């Protein structure tokens, strides 16, 4: 099971500067040496590289776009099969009620429990309605990952109104909640942990130097 | 000449997770895409990789330890010759009063002006008196890099007492001053720029995921 604490997301999609299974493995090493309790990573190849540098538990996804669907985080059983091959400890997937390319969400959850019975699952949700559905489905972890990153949550960011969205998720489910998406400072990490999340995912504020650089430059441009 | 704005330091010494000319070149590309106006980098191999990736001006150093000297930033003519070969726009060196392994500081400044007449020089100092000495020696830039990192500045850190050390350096010299060392947050960057530095170096807060991770974990351990 994931410990309480900091999960570092070590992702770099094609055309991002640090795109490389190799490079993400050394980023995960840095996160381990700095006190992370877990890693979140994208694609079987990055997961397998990370598993050669660190023994931290990994939350795996596969970001892959499909025609005629906006679902791109572990959309179908093809992505699930890649993640079962990766041997990541937690399989995360979009758990929105958006139209998927192939299996429905219920079917994908059933598929994972059948084919990978020793692997925990994490729901990436955008609304309280989705979070409560994920708890019904027996997800091990419910994350706020897609809040602000769907067409129906545009402009909403996790930290808005003193993390009201997170407070609403925590009140709505008894499952382990993960604060993920727009946790960008140590002060925000402390806030979400104080509100009672199991653990938090921090990505860009540690592993996207372009994103961090933009925050430094922007302070001079306000 | 260096512009005003943000210089991102892209360093990873041999024991660090990201040690790699290729990775530091991608850190530098990320910094460029985020709005940096220059790069600081360590070793000829890293600098050459960076300069083939981005056209930003580079402040070059060579960190190399020598017996019976506490000087390790561009300590001798060996390191200067490596930086001349690198074609970096600005050669930075320890500009402390500490005895060097080979050539004195004054010796190395004259050596750079005669062997690389088109290259600007940056003084990494620890004290106001070293800042004044570097102005005497005709440095183009004077940085606060070693303030708090010498045996005669122990316990001192740039940000202490609302950046009083920086205010004292700016009052003491007419040359372009660079805020470098312990510029940890966008708020610190804004403060030093508002106090009148030419530009500021930010390294580990952008390009050392281990140190950023450590800052997230620490907030929970206070
Ligand atoms: Cl990046
Ligand atoms: Cl690091």
Author numbering:
A (entry chain AAA), B (entry chain BBB): 1 to 222
What did the authors write?
The third step in the sialic acid catabolic pathway is mediated by the enzyme N-acetylmannosamine-6-phosphate 2-epimerase (NanE), which catalyzes an inversion of stereochemistry at the C2 position of N-acetylmannosamine-6-phosphate (ManNAc-6P), yielding N-acetylglucosamine-6-phosphate (GlcNAc-6P). The crystal structure of NanE from Staphylococcus aureus, which comprises a triosephosphate isomerase barrel fold with an unusual dimeric architecture, was solved with both natural and modified substrates. NanE is essential for the growth of S. aureus in media containing N-acetylneuraminic acid as the sole carbon source and has a highly conserved active site across both Gram-positive and Gram-negative bacteria. Based on our structural and kinetic data, we propose that NanE performs its epimerization reaction using a novel proton displacement mechanism mediated by the substrate.
As Glu180 forms a short hydrogen bond with the C5 hydroxyl of the substrate, we generated SaNanE-Glu180Ala and tested the effect of this substitution on activity. We found that SaNanE-Glu180Ala retained ∼0.05% activity, but the KM was similar to that of the wildtype enzyme, suggesting that Glu180 plays a role in the catalytic mechanism. The single-residue substitution made no change to the overall structure or the conserved active-site residues. The salt bridge between Arg40 and Asp124 was preserved to stabilize the enolate, and the KM was similar to wildtype SaNanE, indicating that the short bond to the C5 hydroxyl makes only a minor contribution to substrate binding. This suggests that the reduction in kcat is due to the loss of Glu180 in the reaction mechanism rather than a compromise in substrate binding. The residual activity of the enzyme may result from an active-site water molecule that acts in place of Glu180 during catalysis, a phenomenon we have seen before in another unrelated TIM-barrel enzyme, dihydrodipicolinate synthase.
